[PDB]
């Protein structure tokens, strides 16, 4: 397959087989970190305004190669690993990614910039997307995720900034966004719904009496899935892996999410 013109710019993610050209960038969500390709050839990341990072030959693995193709436009982007080519310095930047486990990730890896001013190339399966109308934001420290067997506890408000996710005394399961409107909700209201949790085998749950199947996701069979509610009031159920950043990440490391000080998981990476 081939690429098309990124047309993301102010968001945290690029996408597979999408050109980033000069003078366009990422955003975090939060908007502290930006990633820029700048008009000389220099992709660079910049915190509150200041450059804070460059990518060079001195970044952990990452490899230079030589760029013999005069005719190659300045261009960032992502094809499993990430390439900058950058014919000015003759040279190709690429990442070095931990093994790959098969071709199908080259279709569904993109860059995210993290709230914590990393980049990281995150092999990204969206198993379930109750509001796809709603972009996925990756990286935000706002975002609320439940791990594998989680219980929704009725009445509970779980939320997301101005975002909610609520077992309600009706019985739905009712995700908010942040005017206040439902964005998705399971319509099990006046069923005789009991319980709803986001089982340990990755699916999401509402149970009636009699353990009585009212609704779900149809993901189960994913132990290593998340579900996220995004400030934006976007809910997804997403199986998620890095293999590759500027820090933290190394080849050999186990990857892991950063947790609160509430043991709760947050949409950040880290190793080991
Ligand atoms: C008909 O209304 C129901 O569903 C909406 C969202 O669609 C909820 O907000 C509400 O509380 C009810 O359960």
Known sequence: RTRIPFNGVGTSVLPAYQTLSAGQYLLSPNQRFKLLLQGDGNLVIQDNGATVWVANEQQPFSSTIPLRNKKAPLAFYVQYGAFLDDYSR???????????????????????????????????????????????V???????????????????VY???????????????????????ATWNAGTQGKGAVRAVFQGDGNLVVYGAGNAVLWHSHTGGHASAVLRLQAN???????????????????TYRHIRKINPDQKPIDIWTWH
């Open 233 to 251: 009031g976007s809910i997804a159920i997403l199986d998620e892996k890095p293999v590759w950043a500027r820090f933290g990440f190394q080849p």
């Open 159 to 181: 939320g997301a900034g101005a975002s909610k996710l609520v077992f309600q005394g009706d019985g739905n399961l009712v995700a908010y966004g942040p005017n206040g409107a």
């Open 90 to 136: 003759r040279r190709v930047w690429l990442t070095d990614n931990s093994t790959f486990t098969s071709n199908d990730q080259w279709n569904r890896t993109h860059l995210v910039l993290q709230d914590d001013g990393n980049i990281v190339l995150v092999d990204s399966l969206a198993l379930w997307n109750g509001t796809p109308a709603i972009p996925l």
């Open 138 to 156: 990756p990286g935000a420290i706002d975002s609320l995720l439940l791990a594998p067997g989680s219980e929704l506890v009725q009445g509970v």
